Automatic annotation (TrEMBL):
<protein>
    <submittedName>
        <fullName>Putative vacuolar protein sorting-associated protein</fullName>
    </submittedName>
</protein>
<comment type="similarity">
    <text>Belongs to the sorting nexin family.</text>
</comment>
Length: 220
């Protein structure tokens, strides 16, 4: 591996899942309305049914009334599909969206853990560099106390270990992070796929039912 590449993967993940979290919040809001409308598309269709019935009282003629009731009932099936659909599509997406935020949301805590570590590392690197420059400065003074040169040496050497170790941890945190990303995405498909299946089944019956309703009331 290479140190640049590990940071390149860091900045990428952090930006991407910031875009995604804020995105997920917008799709969630979209859901909240969708439940609310499906609730009241249904009321929309209660009125609709009511008018058909309200018009079968003021006509009665034999070959118009028969279809007219069938149509009220048809409408009540559509009314019903609207109610159904809040728990099909709306509920299914709304639950997985919230869930993806939890998973991004956990990877924000994981980041913060590293991020304090990075912030410490830069202090450790600018301290090391200052010290390394102080030794150089003494050399071209022309006169050095060798005591202080050795006191600087000891702090230079301790900071060299601190940097070497800290950089090592960044790589393996990053390798973990790759595995983490790679796991995370795989889960997000499995999440969506099950959710989709749950939908697929329910949706096929709910519509099968509309078609059956249609046949009954087509044949009048």
């Amino acid at each position: 591996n290479k140190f640049v590449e590990q940071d390149d993967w860091f900045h990428d993940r952090r930006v991407y899942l910031d875009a995604l979290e804020n995105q997920l919040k917008a799709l969630l809001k979209a859901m909240d309305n969708m439940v609310a409308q499906r609730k009241a598309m249904a009321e929309a269709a209660a009125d609709f049914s009511a008018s058909l019935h309200a018009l079968s009282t003021v006509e009665l003629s034999p070959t118009l009334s028969g279809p007219l009731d069938a149509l009220s009932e048809l409408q009540l099936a559509i009314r019903d599909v609207y109610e159904r659909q809040a728990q099909q599509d709306v509920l299914t997406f709304g639950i997985i969206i919230e869930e993806y935020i939890r998973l991004i949301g956990s990877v924000k805590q994981a980041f913060s853990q590293r991020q304090k570590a990075f912030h410490s590392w830069h202090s450790a690197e600018s301290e090391l560099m200052k010290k390394k420059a102080a030794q150089d400065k003494l050399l071209r003074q022309g006169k050095t106390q060798q005591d202080r040169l050795n006191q600087v040496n000891a702090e230079v050497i301790d900071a060299e270990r601190k940097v070497h170790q800290a950089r090592l941890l960044f790589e393996d945190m990053g390798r973990l992070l790759r595995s983490e990303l790679d796991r995370f995405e795989r889960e997000k498909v499995e999440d969506f796929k099950s959710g989709v299946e749950t939908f697929l089944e329910s949706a096929v019956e709910a519509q099968k039912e509309l078609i059956e309703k249609w046949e009954t009331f087509l044949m009048q």
